[PDB]
Amino acid sequence: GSHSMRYFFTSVSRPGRGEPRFIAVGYVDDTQFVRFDSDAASQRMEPRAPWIEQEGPEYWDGETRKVKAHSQTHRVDLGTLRGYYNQSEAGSHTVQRMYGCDVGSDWRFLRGYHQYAYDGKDYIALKEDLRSWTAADMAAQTTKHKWEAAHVAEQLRAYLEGTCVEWLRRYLENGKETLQRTDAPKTHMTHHAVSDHEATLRCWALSFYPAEITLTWQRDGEDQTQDTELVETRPAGDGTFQKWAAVVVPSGQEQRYTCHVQHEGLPKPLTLRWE
């Protein structure tokens, strides 16, 4: 039902090895559709989904111009942040920015976001009202003062509520086959002895889209969350995702253990059993 458009930007300083590395990617939901890499030969925003390829030369020219403008902004930021934190010339540092919009099942605006991190920690974020800022430390307060005086939130709000939502609808429409699909997980459990008295029970979900999923183990109906090993949801490489959850149990107790799968493609949550 619900959809998102998000752009992700990463800039990394490399002191005495030239200019910072800048990478930008754009996603609709869990499907990537554009990239820019500062180190690549093309110096162009490039398509990474079949359905964006139909956009004409104005789009590619304008996206390339805007992405380079974003890059230059982060180039300046790396210098400014080194000053705010009294950091030395030599060490590598990382700025990240993410922004975009969520829409509901009816494709109307739900939420907007515009968040920044420095060296892996929250730095400054646009609040839910898109009128004010959350600044994570004293250096980010300096940025908040400058962004309040420059009316930054007002310019961001118009994009996030309007333009972002308009283009997300266009992409959803043009990529309908890919983007407005739901692939329910194909599920099973595997059993393997680890000794003569214990077995690994691993619950699998394969071939699903979108990536959001919940896999849980119960013992006699009680959640086993501290005893569960749950791996990160991972891409199969074909546009679908995979995940597993495992528990190690005493041999003979298999029938007490059930795996539970929730996904938007399932007409009902599934319970998998060993009997």
Next chain:
Amino acid sequence: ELAXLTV
């Protein structure tokens, strides 16, 4: 499409 900022 991308968004008109420095810290």
Next chain:
Amino acid sequence: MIQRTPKIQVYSRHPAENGKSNFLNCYVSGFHPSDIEVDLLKNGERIEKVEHSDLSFSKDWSFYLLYYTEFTPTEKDEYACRVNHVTLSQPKIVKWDRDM
């Protein structure tokens, strides 16, 4: 400075069947900073024709990358992924286990 260790998974796109073409993936997620060395290994040697995804990150700012190559599993050939990152004191090798 924040440092987060990569979580490494090595796996095939489809269930592995000897003699049937497939894709070998090494997915590294949850790491920070972004500088990372990832190689796919065939019988302990680096595979040359390896592609990767564009650098992206999660809601918690940690990075993720997918490295991948077309391959055809056999009985004898052993596959692995070798990862180095500032958080690892030495490169970490995770073997492909097709019976999970």
